[PDB]
Amino acid sequence: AQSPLLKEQIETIVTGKKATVGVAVWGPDDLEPLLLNPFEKFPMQSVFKLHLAMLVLHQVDQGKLDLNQSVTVNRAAVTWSPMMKDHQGDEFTVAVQQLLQYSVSHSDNVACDLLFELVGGPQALHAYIQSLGVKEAAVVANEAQMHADDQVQYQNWTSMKAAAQVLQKFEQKKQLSETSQALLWKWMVETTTGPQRLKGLLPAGTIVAHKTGTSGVRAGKTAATNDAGVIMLPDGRPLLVAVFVKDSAESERTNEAIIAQVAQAAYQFELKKLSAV
């Protein structure tokens, strides 16, 4: 085993990168996640759409919302949005389910905010996340608010423990009904976002259910390049990895490679154990 050598390997991957790199790793034999930079508040960027989806699907389970329930999107009434690119015309209707797909799989910002409008907004998400017993995270703002002043993304933050905690609650399947859980997983697996992030240095065909977050480049700097998710090991057990690269001065590809490298470290460590029976 030697878990401290796993942490050693990750420190050596991060050291002397011009960024603050938060890490959580939670292997299937670990009672606790390995954390790197456990004191820092990491801007979640779109990683919070995973949280939001959990809130939405919970309310679906409660009969407060319906998956086919419909939402009138008016173009003159409402940023990154495949949903707006996909639909023609000034007004159209989308099912909640479609809103979730756009939000979780495509990081659609408009779909996200429309989902906020249904559940009681950012503070409702905030209180949801606390309800799960996850203390070290905050949601104060929706996507439109973050687009208005890019200091605002720092107000939507998680610690690495809280990143780990939300991935466990997701992976363990106890928060949602079977139908809701299966859908969230599907959206998170079938996303094409961040192919170079947790998946980047894994074997092709490795199942990774994950959610990205990426701020724009401002001031030569990148506030958040994130990826959190569940990697399926070749014994079919889960490996939770979250890597948040914050306030980085490094190239986009470097930021992404940091994530790939850490995730490959954790995965290979897990492979090595399996290799030895």
Of residues 3, 46, 180, 275, which has the active-site annotation? Answer: 46
CATH number of 1-277: 3.40.710.10
CA 238 – CA 188 distance, rounded (Å): 14
Resolution of this entry in Å?
Answer: 2.2
Under 8 Å between Cβ of 115 and 99: yes
DSSP conformation letters of 256-273: HHHHHHHHHHHHHHHHHH
What does the DSSP 8-state code read for residue 151? T
Q: What is the distance between the terminal CA atoms of the chain, rounded to a whole angstrom?
A: 13
**Residue 24, CB-side half-sphere exposure with 13 Å CA sphere:** 29
Q: What beta strand segments (E) does 150-200 contain?
A: 157-158
Under 8 Å between Cβ of 7 and 34: yes
46 catalytic per annotation: yes
Under 8 Å between Cβ of 34 and 23: yes
CA 221 – CA 20 distance, rounded (Å): 12
Q: What are phi and psi of 218, to 5 degrees?
A: -135, 125
The amino acid occupying position 254 is: T
